[PDB]
Swiss-Prot record, chain A:
GO CC entries: blood microparticle; extracellular exosome; extracellular region; extracellular space; IgG immunoglobulin complex; immunoglobulin complex, circulating; plasma membrane
Assembly and oligomerization: Immunoglobulins are composed of two identical heavy chains and two identical light chains; disulfide-linked. Interacts with FCGR1A; this interaction mediates IgG effector functions on monocytes. Interacts with FCGR2A and FCGR3A.
Entire protein: shown range: 119 to 328 of 399
Record-annotated Ig-like domain positions: 3-102, 111-207
Known glycosylation sites: 62
Annotated region described as CH2, given as residue ranges: 1-105
Disulphide-bonded residues: 26-86, 132-190
Molecular-function annotations in GO: antigen binding; Fc-gamma receptor I complex binding; immunoglobulin receptor binding
Post-translational modification: Glycosylation on Asn-62 is required for interaction with Fc receptors and ability to activate the complement pathway. (Microbial infection) Deglycosylation on Asn-62 by S.pyogenes EndoS or Endos2 endoglucosidases prevents interaction between immunoglobulin-gamma (IgG) and Fc receptors, impairing ability to activate the complement pathway.
Name of this chain's protein: Immunoglobulin heavy constant gamma 1
Organism: Homo sapiens
Gene: IGHG1
CH3: region residues: 106-210
Length: 210, 209
């Protein structure tokens, strides 16, 4: 049919905290039933390391399969822009398909975090909007979360990174809360994880004036 | 590789202003010399229509032809859900290729437009940012703009639309200006164009106070 490959980068959060594990997925689509014999081969700066592991395919319920491999990586490795090449061999595919990825190039720029109170003209509604504006950062790989009293709030959405005119990125994070718990003077905070921050983590709190 | 067809919708602003001309564009690529002929058939909710406008072939440096057909649509036909289908036929295709576009099926929701003054903390750079918050709208087709004193303020960026948890949409627009204005009580206004806003427009002013 049409076995094409797709290489994906690790998650931003995973390369910043050594607690978690950053990976490179090498998803191969449209695998034929006939010859489902797909092989993999990794290269770290064309050095070919060994440690990756494969997975059990699935049925794309459209007469095709979908194999996918994943290779673990060192946090500093990936951060220092090394290359990750994933070659997808095959016994029934024209030739050796390949793809490579690495982190965006350029000097990391430190994000500037600001929290914004909900507009008074929203006080009427039953729920208000807490706003976290993260701008001026490079590269765009970033993570955002909101919390309260150490506990993690989950009713929020974050717009993806947007290229600014100066070449850095920005985004907004919106947290939704019952108007009541905002007048009570509760405290909410925006957390931003990024390689350019000291200790890869910054936090700016948001609360009511009186 | 046989011909490929891509269907494009009109621009959001185009469908909200009776003065604009909303168009749906059917583009065809990868048409070799062996069979350069292409036929276009248009359907509006299934009934074939013939008011299109098809431009003639156009070579593409890669030895393949590109053909494009344009269909003008009525503002209300669009805002009302009508579906447009483009059938492309090529003497080298097993079967004709068809594509269909429309306004996302749903029920329009009026967008909430709030403005936000900059954070006191950011008040330390030669530039500041005024925020425009637009939430609770559907469908996601929208348009945002900033202007101060009638004139258009061009140094801004709008985030793309983000699906909220209630199913509606929201976005943020950022207007970056010199703190050497904001401090001088200047007034900035954020305008939004959407199908669910009376007269398809609304405006919110942000001022220093
Ligand atoms: C049969 O059915 C198949 C499967 O069906 C599914 O899909 C539809 C058909 C749907 O209707 C359902 O039926 C069903 O859901 C179907 O396969 C599909 O084929 C498509 C065509 O090839 C594939 O499209 C590609 O998608 C890429 C993006 O993939 C991500 O996003 C999709 C959509 O959300 C998602 O489905 C994928 O899973 C994938 O998500 C990411 O996945 C990785 C790996 O798991 C995650 O990362 C890991 O996560 C773990 C978590 O534990 C951990 O954190 C690890 O650290 C981490 O690594 C991510 O989290 C996850 N992210 C997200 C957001 O979800 C596209 O990139 C790709 O686009 C490129 O190629 C296009 C042409 O092919 C081109 O037009 C396009 O422009 C683009 O090209 C690139 O452009 C860039 C800039 O724009 C440039 O920078 C590049 O240079 C340039 N490159 C190239 C080569 O051009 C492409 O569109 C689709 O993914 C695939 N679906 C599935 C489910 O596999 C098949 O087509 C059907 N067959 C037939 C005949 O119909
Ligand atoms: C041979 O050469 C051909 C010519 O290419 C030349 O390009 C030059 C730039 C240069 O590189 C030359 O050297 C080169 O020769 C080449 O043709 C190209 O083929 C590509 C495919 O291989 C086409 O790619 C598709 O592009 C789509 C978007 O195209 C628009 O945006 C690009 C910029 O990124 C622009 O270049 C295009 O021309 C096009 O512009 C839009 O045009 C429309 C109509 O003209 C405008 O609309 C009108 O605008 C006016 C304003 O005056 C007015 O407002 C009207 O009202 C309005 O209607 C748009 O404004 C304009 N947009 C912009 C930004 O300018 C992609 O969407 C498409 O991706 C889709 O398909 C992929 C699969 O391949 C898939 O991976 C991807 O996810 C996506 O799928 C869609 O996903 C959606 C979900 O998000 C779904 O909703 C959709 O249903 C789903 N669709 C499908 C089908 O699945 C794809 O990447 C490329 O456009 C084309 N180039 C041109 C100029 O047409 C050819 O390939 C070459 N062949 C070979 C063998 O080399």
């Amino acid at each position: 049919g049409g076995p094409s490959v797709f290489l994906f980068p690790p998650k931003p959060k995973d390369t910043l905290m050594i607690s978690r594990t950053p990976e490179v997925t090498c998803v191969v689509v449209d695998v034929s039933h006939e010859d489902p014999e797909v092989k993999f081969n990794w290269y770290v700066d064309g050095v070919e390391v060994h440690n990756a592991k494969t997975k059990p395919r699935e049925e794309q319920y459209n007469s095709t399969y979908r194999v996918v491999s994943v290779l673990t990586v060192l946090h500093q490795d990936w951060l220092n822009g090394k290359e990750y090449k994933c070659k997808v061999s095959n016994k029934a595919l024209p030739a050796p398909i390949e793809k490579t990825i690495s982190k965006a190039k350029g000097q990391p720029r430190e994000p500037q975090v600001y929290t914004l109170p909900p507009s008074r003209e929203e006080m009427t509604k039953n729920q208000v909007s807490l706003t976290c504006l993260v701008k001026g950062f490079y590269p765009s790989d970033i993570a955002v979360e909101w919390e309260s009293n150490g506990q993690p709030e989950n009713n929020y959405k974050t717009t993806p990174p947007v290229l600014d005119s100066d070449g850095s990125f920005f985004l907004y994070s919106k947290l939704t809360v019952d108007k009541s718990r905002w007048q009570q003077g509760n405290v909410f905070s925006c957390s931003v994880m990024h390689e350019a921050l000291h200790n890869h983590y910054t936090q700016k709190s948001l609360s009511l004036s009186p």
